[PDB]
Amino acid sequence: EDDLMRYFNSNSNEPPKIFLTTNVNAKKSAYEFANILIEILPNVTFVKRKFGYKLKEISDICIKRNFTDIVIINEDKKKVTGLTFIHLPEGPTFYFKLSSFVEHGRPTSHIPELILNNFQTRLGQTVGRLFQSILPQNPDIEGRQVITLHNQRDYIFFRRHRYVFKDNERVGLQELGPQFTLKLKRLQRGIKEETEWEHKPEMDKEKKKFY
Amino acid sequence: SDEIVWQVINQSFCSHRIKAPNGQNFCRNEYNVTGLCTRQSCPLANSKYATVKCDNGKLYLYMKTPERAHTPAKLWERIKLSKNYTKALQQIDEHLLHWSKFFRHKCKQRFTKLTQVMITERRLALREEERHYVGVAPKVKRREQNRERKALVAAKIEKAIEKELMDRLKSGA
Amino acid sequence: LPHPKIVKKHTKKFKRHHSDRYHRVAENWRKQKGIDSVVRRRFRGNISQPKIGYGSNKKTKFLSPSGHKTFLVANVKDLETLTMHTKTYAAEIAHNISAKNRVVILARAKALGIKVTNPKGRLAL
Amino acid sequence: SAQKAPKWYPSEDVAALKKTRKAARPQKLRASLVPGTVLILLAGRFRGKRVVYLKHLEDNTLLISGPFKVNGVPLRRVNARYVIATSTKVSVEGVNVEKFNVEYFAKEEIKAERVEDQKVVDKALIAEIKKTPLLKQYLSASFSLKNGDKPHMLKF
Amino acid sequence: NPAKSASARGSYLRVSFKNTRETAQAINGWELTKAQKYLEQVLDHQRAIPFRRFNSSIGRTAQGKEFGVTKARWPAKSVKFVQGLLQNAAANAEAKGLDATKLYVSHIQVNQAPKESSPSHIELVVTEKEEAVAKAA
RNA sequence: AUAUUGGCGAGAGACCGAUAGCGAACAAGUACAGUGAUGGAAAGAUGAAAAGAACUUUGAAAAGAGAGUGAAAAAGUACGUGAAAUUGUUGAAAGGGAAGGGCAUUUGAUCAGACA
């Protein structure tokens, strides 16, 4: 539980270095997408991935270079489609699906504050755990930037905003940063060897549950 | 005979032809050398017919003798073709002694391509690919469209943040 | 396979006369049968007609830009016909083939080295 | 089927090329290109530059130097047609240009050997440029076309 | 954003279509409080609706100078249907829990209905006008 | 033995597939028109199962927005699929007494492979 918090996920002890790579032979939109993750994630290095070094051979490099997490974005066609967060030692790994990206905010260099919604389910709070870990644990209050991760279904929406406080019990906020929708898949448990959940269409049949 | 077999399948049906838009004709009778079909390049019209095939990794060269026109059960006599390329082309040559120069270099040619089909192993040793083709069934395409549009409506993200900023900064005053 | 450079002679579509004027007249070509038509008597400034002079080069006829003749394929047994003719013909997976079977045909065509003209057909992730 | 297979098939056997009677002959350059001539380049990195002409190469190029000490043009290969050849000539006989060839320029920061070879050539060439007045100033400056210049009339 | 929106719709409404088109586009892109006040003024002949497309034999008036049009009319019945919908959309917004003051009609659309009669469908979608922003060095 | 476009009752089709096939697949010889003899239409399909939308809110109400049912309301009795004419909205572009068309290109939009 508390032992888990540290052993599988990154805590407020180090700066977490995130090895941002891309699926082989990707085009403009993937790097355009990498430029949006270059801002939001704490200490990203972009690695141009040049054919070979299967997966374990990568892990050997990021042990030596001493990274914490791997993130890989993929493209079937000209649109971005899938996002894969892996933790480098042990390997709790989360796969995701993007069906929304639309682009007037233009943010500062100040580091954004986190907020999460509706993770009653234990599988939900293990994903909430990932985004608590992978995003910065700095929040500088001033600069007034908020990153959300709302999950009212099995769909998770992340957005950025600017909050203005008036003393009459109300707060205003403007749209900023990338529009986004994610879907959880897999939880491969080993680096890529094992599964814990792996979405099927055998769900959607229930119309409920919500993991 | 065989001229009568040819004319009756040239027109009047060879019921395994593919008419390509190029006007080309392809016999899919598994035992032909050229995938295309023409006179004595398709294995029914011709009576003497050689071919290279593969059943496993073992590349055999099948051979059809006019002796066996009576019995279709044992038509194609077959011989294994070692595995090294140089001795195999030499192995080929001896079988094709005193035949048409058609089957001479064309079985040599079948063997060539089918050996460089064993570039499959090259693709399958250095596989380790993190992609794999996924179908997009149009039912799922709407279970994951019309439920996201129903999610956002019931989500009320603004009100959720408006709550959990006031509820935060009252307790963190 | 070594081919000449492709010269098309007429890149444009031979649209029917007054197909753009009226909606009931289809864009599909028909010859103006009437004796007093200025199209039939091929006047200056009137639409060009299909005639045999526009015939494509025989060595580069039916060829896609890559110098390949397109060949429709439904399944593995029909794809296996183009084993010997890899640099002449290229596979075209038929429109009605399911997403389950397209992955079978694409993997098999990769193995034999036969070129598929239409990948990404029903290959959504 | 779905396209019944054709009766005739075109042959798979690749045809051997017919014997070509096209024998390569060495390039006959124009008379204005004599080894040791002040050139003006037209296209490339060094457009509008005055340049010393040194050697005719094997791949129909021409080997030329600035010198690099004067105008910033090193030992370059150049095309014959991309070049203006003026009448002014410097002596070239004292330069050891004979060493390098086509194989010297194979590409597949800057190599030190290239800088050393440059300085060896450039010393033996300034040895001649220093003689005639203002020629070093003429090499340093860039060629252009002023308003009213007719290249068909400008006897270069 | 569907979260920042409310929408009313009237269907198979026995109104003149050609009048409804004009009074719909007259009110398009306006703040809700200004919009409802405007239609009250049209009812009392204070302001007139600018007629632009379906505008034959309309009496020329001075009140059209606001919109840069010579022709203008006071169509009581058509406006009556529209302010009924706007009152409905206002209550639809307060059902969801939107702000009333920052509300404006974004998409108002009117098209013909099955028929002789000449009935018409109307739909209008009201939206928040979101500003509320700050920065830090 | 032969005839048999009626009646009673079967069996069939290289026939038609809702502007076809009988006039009529259906409240069809019906609605209706004609003083009357007569003339005589149009009109098929929710879904596997009504599970035909409980409840909340807005409105005088029809209805609207939520919510729910269903595999799918992109199936809600105006219900299979839903073309074009014609219209609305949104985005781009053009427009000094016509427009659409051809040859060629700029510009803007958009797209195909090859680099497996």
Curated annotation (Swiss-Prot), chain A:
GO biological process, one term: maturation of LSU-rRNA from tricistronic rRNA transcript (SSU-rRNA, 5.8S rRNA, LSU-rRNA)
Compartments, as annotated in UniProt: Nucleus, Nucleolus
Gene Ontology MF terms in the entry: rRNA primary transcript binding
Location of region: RNA-binding: 171-188
Domain of life per record: Eukaryota
Stretches assigned to the Brix domain: 16-193
Keyword terms, alphabetized: Nucleus, Ribosome biogenesis, RNA-binding, rRNA processing, rRNA-binding
The keyword Nucleus is assigned to this record: yes
GO cellular component, one term: preribosome, large subunit precursor
Other remarks in the entry: Present with 784 molecules/cell in log phase SD medium.
Function: Essential protein. Required for biogenesis of the 60S ribosomal subunit.
Subunit structure: Part of a complex that includes BRX1, RPF1, RPF2 and SSF1 or SSF2.
Protein name: Ribosome production factor 1
Annotated gene: RPF1
Curated annotation (Swiss-Prot), chain B:
UniProt key word Repeat: yes
Subcellular location: Nucleus
Location of the motif Nuclear localization signal: 138-143
Keyword line: Cell cycle, Nucleus, Repeat
GO CC terms: nucleolus; preribosome, large subunit precursor
Superkingdom classification of source: Eukaryota
BP GO terms, sorted: maturation of 5.8S rRNA; maturation of 5.8S rRNA from tricistronic rRNA transcript (SSU-rRNA, 5.8S rRNA, LSU-rRNA); maturation of LSU-rRNA; maturation of LSU-rRNA from tricistronic rRNA transcript (SSU-rRNA, 5.8S rRNA, LSU-rRNA); ribosomal large subunit biogenesis
Described function: Its role might be as part of the apparatus concerned with the nuclear events of the cell cycle.
Protein family membership: Belongs to the MAK16 family.
Name under which the protein is recorded: Protein MAK16
Gene source species: Saccharomyces cerevisiae (strain ATCC 204508 / S288c)
Gene responsible for this protein: MAK16
Covered range of the whole protein: 2 to 174 of 306
From Swiss-Prot, chain C:
Locations listed in the record: Cytoplasm
Molecular function terms, GO-annotated: structural constituent of ribosome
BP GO annotations: cytoplasmic translation
GO cellular component: cytoplasm; cytosol; cytosolic large ribosomal subunit
Record PTM Phosphoserine, positions in chain: 37
Keyword Lipid metabolism on entry: no
Pfam assignment, any one: Ribosomal_L32e
Keyword terms, alphabetized: Cytoplasm, Phosphoprotein, Ribonucleoprotein, Ribosomal protein
Record-linked CDD domains: Ribosomal_L32_L32e
Keyword Ribonucleoprotein (UniProt): yes
InterPro entries hit by this protein: Ribosomal_eL32, Ribosomal_eL32_CS, Ribosomal_eL32_sf
Annotated family: Belongs to the eukaryotic ribosomal protein eL32 family.
Chain's role: Component of the ribosome, a large ribonucleoprotein complex responsible for the synthesis of proteins in the cell. The small ribosomal subunit (SSU) binds messenger RNAs (mRNAs) and translates the encoded message by selecting cognate aminoacyl-transfer RNA (tRNA) molecules. The large subunit (LSU) contains the ribosomal catalytic site termed the peptidyl transferase center (PTC), which catalyzes the formation of peptide bonds, thereby polymerizing the amino acids delivered by tRNAs into a polypeptide chain.
Subunit text: Component of the large ribosomal subunit (LSU). Mature yeast ribosomes consist of a small (40S) and a large (60S) subunit. The 40S small subunit contains 1 molecule of ribosomal RNA (18S rRNA) and 33 different proteins (encoded by 57 genes). The large 60S subunit contains 3 rRNA molecules (25S, 5.8S and 5S rRNA) and 46 different proteins (encoded by 81 genes).
Protein name per UniProt: Large ribosomal subunit protein eL32
From Swiss-Prot, chain E:
Cited function: Component of the ribosome, a large ribonucleoprotein complex responsible for the synthesis of proteins in the cell. The small ribosomal subunit (SSU) binds messenger RNAs (mRNAs) and translates the encoded message by selecting cognate aminoacyl-transfer RNA (tRNA) molecules. The large subunit (LSU) contains the ribosomal catalytic site termed the peptidyl transferase center (PTC), which catalyzes the formation of peptide bonds, thereby polymerizing the amino acids delivered by tRNAs into a polypeptide chain.
GO molecular-function term, one example from the UniProt record: structural constituent of ribosome
Gene designation per UniProt: RPL17A
Covalent crosslink: Glycyl lysine isopeptide (Lys-Gly) (interchain with G-Cter in ubiquitin): 37
GO terms of biological process kind: cleavage in ITS2 between 5.8S rRNA and LSU-rRNA of tricistronic rRNA transcript (SSU-rRNA, 5.8S rRNA, LSU-rRNA); cytoplasmic translation
Residue numbers bearing the Phosphothreonine modification: 61
Domain of life of the native organism: Eukaryota
Membrane-spanning intervals of the chain: none
Name this protein carries in UniProt: Large ribosomal subunit protein uL22A
Source species of the chain: Saccharomyces cerevisiae (strain ATCC 204508 / S288c)
Entry keywords, A to Z: Cytoplasm, Isopeptide bond, Phosphoprotein, Ribonucleoprotein, Ribosomal protein, Ubl conjugation
Residues of the full protein shown: 10 to 161 of 184
